[PDB]
């Protein structure tokens with residue numbers, strides 16, 4: 001069984017749970033505030049910073065390298081633009097770094113530094129969602145918060161180097177399927193993808209509490 005399929009299958013249940021977190025349920029209904037949106041986007045800034053630091057560390061490592069697509073996929077620059085938009089020019093000392101965000105970052109560094117063969121789980125969980133469902137979330141955000149089609153404040157959700165998210169997704173999955181796989185690696189990769197998803201749920205839980 002192909003890795004791309006094994007991951008989709010292993011995470012379909014937890015994905016249902018993630019969409020139904022209180023924060024995402026409210027987000028999807030069009031009830032996201034600037035305060036709530038700023039918190040989540042600041043937390044992603046930290047998460048994608050860590051993810052992409054570890055990607056760069058492992059770019060030549062054959063357990064990751066076939067997924068090395070910085071120009072197309074990396075979000076850190078986009079998130080910096082969004083931070084300047086939402087938080088102003090002194091955003092680096094305005095933005096929060098919540099405990100659940102720190103916890104996700106920690107696991108990202110553990111994976112990148114000690115278990116790089118699992119980094120694909122984390123890239124899969126974030127980037128493939130951003131290319132799929134994130135495009136729906138973009139539209140809802142834009143409408144909720146009166147964000148302009150010209151894209152300011154939603155750079156995260158915009159992939160100017162990818163013509164067509166569906167075709168790129170199909171390429172990315174094809175390339176995942178070229179990673180050297182043993183039963184050991186495959187089983188732990190799909191476990192770590194479930195952990196990535198839980199880390200996200202835990203963040204959304206935390207943000208919702210901080211908002212109430």
Ligand code: HEM
Pocket residue numbers: 004007008015018019020024025027028124125126128129130132133134136196197200
């Ligand atoms: C309200 C919240 C969300 C909505 C409405 C949403 C919606 C979607 C939609 C419509 C797809 C495409 C499904 C398909 O192609 O059959 C998708 C795929 C994906 N989503 Fe989300 N999603 C949400 C939250 C999340 C979160 C929180 C994560 C991860 C942290 C995530 C990760 C993914 C991944 C990895 C895929 C790719 C599945 C695959 O093709 O293997 N989703 N989601």
